[PDB]
Design a protein around this nucleic acid. Structure first.
Ligand SMILES: Nc1ncnc2c1ncn2[C@@H]1O[C@H](COP(=O)(O)OP(=O)(O)OP(=O)(O)O)[C@@H](O)[C@H]1O
Ligand SMILES: [Mg+2]
Length: 468
RNA sequence: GGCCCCAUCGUCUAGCGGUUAGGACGCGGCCCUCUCAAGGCCGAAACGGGGGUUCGAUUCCCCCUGGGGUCACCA
C-alpha cells in the first residue's frame, strides 16, 4: 500500500512548516487508503526543547490531522521516538562498517574546523586508517564518529517524483557522519533506517532536503534496501521570499491558536500553499482535500505566507462554514481570556450572531463587542462628540422609551423612525447619537438589534448614564 | 562562491500549442444602508530577457537574468 510519515524535531514551538508537510503526507496516505506515521526526531540532545513533543502532537490534532502510528497511539513498529531506538542505529552503523560502506573518524571538533577552513569540507582523511587500528582505537574508547564512505569517483542518480531525475556527482556528496561521537545518529542514518523498518514507501518532505537525497539513495543501496519514492515540497516563504522564519513571520502554530485563527481555516489556507482544486474553489474541507489530491495540481514555486489572506479566510469560515452555535462555542475561551462573561447561552448566541460579519479572528470578538458584556467599555472621541451633539434629541426621546411597552426590534424601529420624522430630522441623527450612548462606539451592528438585545431596563439604565 | 531547485497580476494561483491570459486576497469606485462591517457590481494589476522548435508560443528545448535552497558530530 502507501505509507507516509512526518519526522518532527522537538526543538522549538510547533512549526507551521511542519503542519504544512504533515497536511500533504496525511492526504497522500488517506487518498491511497494507506498509513500516515509520526516519528519524533529527538537525536540532537543539544537543541532538544523539553515539552516540545507534546506540543507538536497536539497542534497536529488541533489542525484535524490524525495519524495511524505514533508515540501516543502505538503501532506495530515502535518505538516512535528515535531516542528510544539508539541501539538500532548503533547496530546498522556497524553493519555498514563491516560492509566497507562506512568508517570510523577520530578528528576532534577543532581539527575538523581547521580542515574545513583549509580544504573546505572534510577530506575523508580517516579512510586511510587501517580498519583493525580503527576497531582497536574504538575499543580503547577513543571518542569518534562513523562516516558514510561515499564511492569515489562516481555519480548518483536521485529521482524526485515532481521534478524528474537529477544526476549528482559523488564529489558533491560528502562522507557525512552517520553516527555522532555521543552515540546518537544523524537524520541521514536514522531517516533511512527508520523509514525502512516502518515500511514507508512515500517520503514527502520540504525541498530543503533535496540535496541530501543522494546520501539517502546511497544508504539504501549500502543496506541493500529498496528506496522509497521522493516528493519534495516547496518551502513556505516569508514576505521577502526567504524560507519562512520566526523573525520575518509567525511560524508558531500556538501563536495562531492564541490569535483566534480557526484550525479549519488555517488547514484550508495551508492547502492553497502549493495546491488548487480543478474548479478553482478556495473554501473546502479536509476530506474534500484528500479526495481531490493529485501531484498534478501541486505547484512548485516558493509560496509566500500571506497573513492578510489567512485572516480573510478565517473570517469566511466564521461566517459561512461554521454554524452560529459553533462560533459561539469557540468564542468562549476568548471572552474568558478578556475577563468577560456572558449571562447565558441564549445571550451569547445572539451577541455572536450580531457580530458574525464584523470579526475575522475569535480574539477580535471580545474586542469589538466588549460593550455587550461589560459596562467597562471605552468611548471614542468621535462617539463622545456625536453623543454631546445629540443630547437634546436623546433627552426628548428618553421619555418615549421608558413608556415603550413592546420592546422589540420591529416596534423600536417604528418608534425611532416616527420620532425622527415628528422631529423633522433624518434617522441617522437620532440613531447615531443613541448608538454612541449605548455602545461607546460609532462602528457597531444595527441600532434596532443592539437596542433590543439588552432589554428595556438594561438599555435605559445605560442611556441614563449618558444623559446624566 | 560550488552544486541543486524554481520562474503568470503586489501575494496565492488556473492555463497543459491557437484564450479578450481566468479566479482569489489586497487595492479603487459604485450599490445596499441608522454607523461600521458583510454582501452584490464594476475596475486598475501578470506571462523577466534573448535564441530557437513550430503555420503559431505563456505553454516545448537552450543560454542569460532573477529568486530560493544547500554546503555541520541540526534537522
Ligand atoms: N520552514 C519550513 N518550511 C517548510 N517545511 C518545513 C520547514 N521546516 C521544516 N519543514 C518540513 O516539515 C517536516 C517537519 O520538520 P521539523 O519538525 O524538523 O521542523 P524544522 O523547522 O525542520 O526544525 P529543525 O530546525 O530541527 O530542522 C519535515 O519533513 C521538513 O521537511
Ligand atoms: Mg488582466
Amino acid at each position: 500500500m502507501v505509507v507516509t510519515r512526518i519526522a518532527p524535531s522537538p526543538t522549538g514551538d510547533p512549526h507551521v512548516g511542519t503542519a504544512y508537510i504533515a497536511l500533504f503526507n496525511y492526504a497522500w496516505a488517506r487518498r491511497n487508503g494507506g498509513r500516515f506515521i509520526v516519528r519524533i526526531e529527538d537525536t540532537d540532545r543539544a537543541r532538544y526543547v523539553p515539552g516540545a513533543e507534546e506540543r507538536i502532537l497536539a497542534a497536529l490534532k488541533w489542525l484535524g490531522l490524525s495519524y495511524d502510528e505514533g508515540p501516543d497511539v502505538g503501532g506495530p513498529h515502535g518505538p516512535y521516538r528515535q531516542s528510544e531506538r539508539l541501539p538500532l542505529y548503533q547496530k546498522y552503523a556497524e553493519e555498514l562498517l563491516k560492509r566497507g560502506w562506512a568508517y570510523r573518524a577520530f578528528e576532534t571538533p577543532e581539527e575538523l574546523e581547521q580542515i574545513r577552513k583549509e580544504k573546505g569540507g572534510y577530506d575523508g582523511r580517516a579512510r586511510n586508517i587501517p580498519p583493525e587500528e580503527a576497531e582497536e582505537r574504538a575499543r580503547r574508547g577513543e571518542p569518534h564518529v562513523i562516516r558514510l564512505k561515499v564511492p569515489r569517483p562516481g555519480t548518483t542518480e536521485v529521482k524526485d517524483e515532481l521534478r524528474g531525475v537529477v544526476v549528482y556527482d559523488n564529489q558533491e556528496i560528502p562522507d557525512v557522519v552517520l553516527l555522532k561521537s555521543d552515540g546518537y545518529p544523524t537524520y541521514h542514518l536514522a531517516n533511512v533506517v527508520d523509514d525502512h523498518l516502518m515500511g514507508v514507501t512515500d517520503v514527502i518532505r520540504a525541498e530543503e532536503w533535496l540535496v541530501s537525497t543522494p546520501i539517502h539513495v546511497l544508504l539504501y543501496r549500502a543496506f541493500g534496501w529498496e528506496a522509497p519514492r521522493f516528493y519534495h515540497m516547496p518551502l513556505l516563504r516569508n514576505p521577502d521570499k526567504t524560507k519562512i522564519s520566526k523573525r520575518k513571520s509567525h511560524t508558531s502554530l500556538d501563536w495562531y491558536k492564541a490569535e483566534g485563527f480557526l484550525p479549519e481555516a488555517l488547514r484550508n489556507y495551508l492547502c492553497l500553499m502549493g495546491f488548487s482544486m480543478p474548479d478553482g474553489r478556495e473554501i473546502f474541507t479536509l476530506e474534500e482535500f484528500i479526495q481531490a489530491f493529485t501531484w498534478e495540481r501541486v505547484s512548485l514555486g516558493g509560496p509566500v505566507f500571506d497573513l492578510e489572506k489567512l485572516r480573510w479566510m478565517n473570517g469566511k469560515y466564521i461566517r459561512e462554514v461554521l454554524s452560529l452555535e459553533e462560533v459561539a462555542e469557540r468564542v468562549k475561551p476568548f471572552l474568558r481570556e478578556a475577563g468577560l462573561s456572558w449571562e447565558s447561552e441564549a445571550y451569547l448566541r445572539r451577541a455572536v450572531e450580531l457580530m458574525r460579519p464584523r470579526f475575522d479572528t475569535l480574539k477580535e470578538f471580545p474586542e469589538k463587542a466588549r460593550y455587550l458584556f461589560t459596562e467597562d467599555y471605552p468611548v471614542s472621541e468621535k462617539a463622545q462628540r456625536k453623543l454631546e451633539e445629540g443630547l437634546p434629541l436623546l433627552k426628548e426621546l428618553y421619555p418615549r422609551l421608558r413608556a415603550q411597552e413592546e420592546w422589540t426590534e420591529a416596534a423600536l424601529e417604528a418608534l425611532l423612525r416616527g420620532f425622527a420624522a415628528e422631529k423633522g430630522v433624518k434617522l441617522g441623527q437620532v440613531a447615531q447619537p443613541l448608538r454612541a450612548a449605548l455602545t461607546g462606539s460609532l462602528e457597531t451592528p444595527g441600532l434596532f438589534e443592539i437596542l433590543a438585545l439588552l432589554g428595556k431596563e438594561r438599555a435605559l439604565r445605560r442611556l441614563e448614564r449618558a444623559l446624566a
